Amino acid sequence: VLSADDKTNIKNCWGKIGGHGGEYGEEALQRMFAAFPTTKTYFSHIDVSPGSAQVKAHGKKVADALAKAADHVEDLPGALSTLSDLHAHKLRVDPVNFKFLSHCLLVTLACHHPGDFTPAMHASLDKFLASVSTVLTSKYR
Amino acid sequence: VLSADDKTNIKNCWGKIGGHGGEYGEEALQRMFAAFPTTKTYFSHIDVSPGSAQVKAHGKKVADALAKAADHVEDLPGALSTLSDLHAHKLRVDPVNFKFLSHCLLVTLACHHPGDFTPAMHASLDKFLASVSTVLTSKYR
Amino acid sequence: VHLTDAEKAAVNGLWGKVNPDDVGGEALGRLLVVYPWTQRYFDSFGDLSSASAIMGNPKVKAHGKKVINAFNDGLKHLDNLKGTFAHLSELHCDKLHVDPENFRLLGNMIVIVLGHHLGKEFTPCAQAAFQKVVAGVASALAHKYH
Amino acid sequence: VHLTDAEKAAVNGLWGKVNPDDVGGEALGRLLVVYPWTQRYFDSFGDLSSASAIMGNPKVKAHGKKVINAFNDGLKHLDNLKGTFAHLSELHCDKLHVDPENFRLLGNMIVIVLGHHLGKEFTPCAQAAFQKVVAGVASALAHKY
Ligand code: HEM
Ligand code: HEM
Ligand code: HEM
Ligand code: HEM
Structure with a gap:
């Protein structure tokens, strides 16, 4: 659900992420493909090799989608309706995959920003990605 | 997240329930204690015997809490924050117990209102109990 | 699976007065409605x-x-679930990559369809016995993960 | 519990350059913060x-x-994980009544702490090898059930 503290924590992290977002999204996916080979099935149509332009x-x-979710924290259903139709109606993504990517995203941010990645920050980010996942696997209109 | 059809269906169900509410809530708890004995841990301080006034x-x-949640579907964190402090801050209930109770409740309704318990209703009710569960297990103040 | 004798007579008796074909069909259908990603x-x-x-x-x-x-x-073979479902455990996991969490979801769907069909005869005690079976069945298909 | 030769060399090559006591301290500490019900x-x-x-x-x-x-x-005993975690499986599931899903949560906490402590050395390949381990340890403690 996210508290007041949770929101400003989310805003500060994506503040400190800035332009580095693209690298962390990429890395998160590589980690998801490597650690959970099951998720590769959904990307059968692109090259998924370690260093891949796709x-x-x-x-x-x-990363852009997560940056937009951090801006409109108080309206996650509204901000990501298009992405919700993609993943829930069209793609039919199993929810566990989101837990896999969420985790690989938290590992990445822990590897790159260990100073700012506190226990209290980590709690906020885990909650944030969980609510992003809820909206994405949901089906509304 | 709940759609317009989910909103309509939850209202239409708690209309059919009305005063039969507490009767079903009692049966749900009684089903939970029997099918998932783990949950009896949280009720050490009361008599849990099948026939029990407590x-x-x-x-x-x-039942009244679920009825209230049905009234304020559009603002669930608002209406239930007093119960969220009880369950998340004070009792610190394991989220799996909420799945257990949600299921036992859905079993109960299917035993008493099998004409109304259509696959489409089932869905709407399951999302409801999930998002009610999310607020209650979730800690935001 | 534990299962006592009264817990046995509760399972085989109520199963006897339902149509397994109709229970299976609706449970799968309900799984596909309630959990759309399946x-x-x-x-x-x-x-x-x-x-x-x-x-x-x-x-x-x-x-x-x-x-x-x-x-x-x-x-019929509650002594050995792991062997009774071993072949299907290989199919669902190695070949189809179905996540074990789904197995218990279909388990729940079966339980509620029973209550939907049996009414007030699907007593709390009867649910408790069927809950042990469906959880046992679910974890027998997941037993390859391990 | 796969662990090929490459996955073997990664796991103990990287495990040897962290303080294991501190890893367990922080990972547990984080589990209590991130998932408060624990x-x-x-x-x-x-x-x-x-x-x-x-x-x-x-x-x-x-x-x-x-x-x-x-x-x-x-x-040390990846060959017989179910037998190594025999006593602890009984302890958590019968005496303590801990839900199995909580095991994979603590596993994930271990994983990210390694990453926290190692940075760029905790490569995607090295995560996969450690992920195979923690999932195995989780399904060795739960496995009643
Ligand atoms: C919270 C994490 C996630 C975010 C922020 C996200 C966001 C996005 C975005 C922005 C796109 C491109 C939209 C477009 O222009 O078409 C996309 C597409 C896609 N997503 Fe995700 N997604 C997430 C999780 C997942 C997961 C877990 C999977 C399953 C492994 C998945 C599978 C896909 C697939 C198959 C596409 C289509 C790719 C293509 O062919 O262009 N997504 N998602
Ligand atoms: C899922 C929907 C649930 C709702 C709507 C709900 C609602 C309530 C309500 C209305 C109260 C009484 C408030 C008061 O006057 O103190 C209460 C108390 C309590 N609930 Fe829940 N509850 C839910 C789930 C659960 C679950 C799953 C558990 C754990 C098995 C649980 C454990 C407790 C306990 C231990 C109390 C305090 C009882 C006492 O000391 O009198 N609740 N809840
Ligand atoms: C929970 C207990 C389950 C049982 C007892 C069961 C039973 C079976 C059996 C016997 C078959 C093979 C039938 C044949 O060879 O013709 C099968 C196939 C299959 N099952 Fe299940 N299953 C279970 C769970 C699930 C769940 C939850 C899913 C949903 C993801 C699933 C998805 C599939 C698929 C995709 C096939 C192959 C489809 C095809 O034949 O074209 N299974 N199942
Ligand atoms: C990574 C998987 C886990 C391992 C390897 C592990 C290990 C252990 C060990 C070795 C002990 C006994 C310590 C001794 O010998 O004195 C213990 C106790 C205990 N564990 Fe775990 N554990 C795991 C998961 C969990 C989780 C996730 C929880 C949280 C619900 C938990 C809750 C407990 C509790 C409450 C005790 C009793 C502590 C006491 O003596 O007061 N365990 N654990």
């Missing part, structure tokens, strides 16, 4:  |  | 566009018959 | 009402040392 491009798309 | 009274408290 | 695992079934469509679907009804036959074998 | 199971631990409190709690640090010691047994 994965790098998609990595940036994800 | 379980009967607690069922009526749960 | 629709992806069943591409072979044609369009699964709406609640009206996925219930009338003859290929869903026929598959619920297959799911409930496997379930029925479990009741 | 605090209930550790009532023998005194105060657990804030992030600053539970990270500085000695009882927590001592227990993470216990938890990582059992984890360390796993690495």
